[PDB]
Amino acid sequence: SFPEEVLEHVFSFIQLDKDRNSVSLVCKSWYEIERWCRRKVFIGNCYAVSPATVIRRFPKVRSVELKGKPHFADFNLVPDGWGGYVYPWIEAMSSSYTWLEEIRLKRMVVTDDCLELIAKSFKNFKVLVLSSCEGFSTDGLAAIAATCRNLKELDLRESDVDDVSGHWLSHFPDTYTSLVSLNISCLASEVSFSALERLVTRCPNLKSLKLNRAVPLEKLATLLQRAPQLEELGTGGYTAEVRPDVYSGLSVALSGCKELRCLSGFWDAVPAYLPAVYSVCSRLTTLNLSYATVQSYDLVKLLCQCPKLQRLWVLDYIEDAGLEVLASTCKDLRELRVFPSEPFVMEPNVALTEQGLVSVSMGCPKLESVLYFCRQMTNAALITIARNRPNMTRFRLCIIEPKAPDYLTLEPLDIGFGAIVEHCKDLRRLSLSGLLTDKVFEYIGTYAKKMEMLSVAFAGDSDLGMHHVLSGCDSLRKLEIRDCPFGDKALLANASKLETMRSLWMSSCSVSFGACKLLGQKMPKLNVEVIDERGAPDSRPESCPVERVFIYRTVAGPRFDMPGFVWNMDQ
């Protein structure tokens, strides 16, 4: 009940977005005090609200996070030009947020113009994370490097950069020294290497260096001798003539890095050079081998020595036998990602099946987080997995053949998934696959009460299934569906669910254009977007399924930068 300054100082110890939202709703007084001391803002859907809105309400923000295209952009199911442009944000912030420090962007279109504007409006600019973004070039980054004198983090992870010129990196002045974190690893072009060594050499706080694979294996040791304090290393190319001097050097240099917790990169890795990495290995909590194309045996030899390993991302080359050795050596595993080595041929090239996942189910009592590509699976295996891991959190299991049944048994996988979902009571994330009838959906609506994100393809028999989901799924935030018999009847019968959810994606389903227009009319605070390259939707009868609807709730109303193939159903 006391002044205004004590509340503020109290607030300063409150940092979770939820907590701040809550205090903002106590009474008008608190709404005002929090407003004014809100240090960061998280905007999961850039079109959900306008910049003018964010900037007028939290005028003191130091740190901004924005997310653009829906997840399925990754699979490119969203045509180019659809939207996600960050420029309007930067333009609006550049005059209000003078003291801005941190920008984190996901799946947005980000332009060299954006990058210059940031460089030259935010003097205290410290952190730039660009995560699967597109639209910019090494020229933009040259801007950042030349101008951002206080920069600590440049993280380019999984972005598509128009790759003019490795010259941009030598634009960091000699008086620059502040770098904590360079994630370089999506760039094709090749940085100046003496510039890179000068840079790493003079930033004594460098903690995380992820290379560029145009920095060839023979050069890594020079780098590592300059940054013995490293905690995360991303190699460049991991290939070279087999020679003893070059092996010996890599290896003294790595075992020089007593602080490595995270090892990644390994393009083109040669078996003959991995063991250089071993002494580092006692200690790793994160190993990402997902671009090494090495055989299950050499993986195992490496795994055998990562007792503290908490997170593994690897190729399917690891195999059932390699994963079993996994279950045995890594009792502290939280997260396993197994990626497809050859996701575009039908025949198995690799002996990796339900069995490896079962192994790991039983052997890693702390495994909570799974992404798995294989070519076959069973109800029985899923059921043993759910039984062994009722603490699973995130379960993403992708069978490469579209409607593959249980291969022993030949049924739909409905009960296997029923089991993961009945038994794993804190499952917040599910993606499933294989032969699936309206009945999984039903299980999903009955048991999956905590579940937040659900991904599905080539599944169900009718609108009943999608109904059970939008029906039963208390905590649904993101629902994304391709190529299923789900349409007008389940969508409109659940129209009001949609206001509680960040987004529904539906492509190639049976949603008529007519249900799209009716939905837009019932629900004026959804943007219901038809995204359909065949030309204007009265071209065809309203009876006619649109190619993609994307639906998301918002306070900005309809958005200003639709291109030619996106229509909003407001009117």
Partner: peptide
């Protein structure tokens, strides 16, 4: 094959 399947960010198909 089908567009966008299987869902992965690799290069061909």
């Amino acid at each position: 094959q089908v567009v966008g399947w299987p869902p992965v960010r690799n290069y061909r198909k």
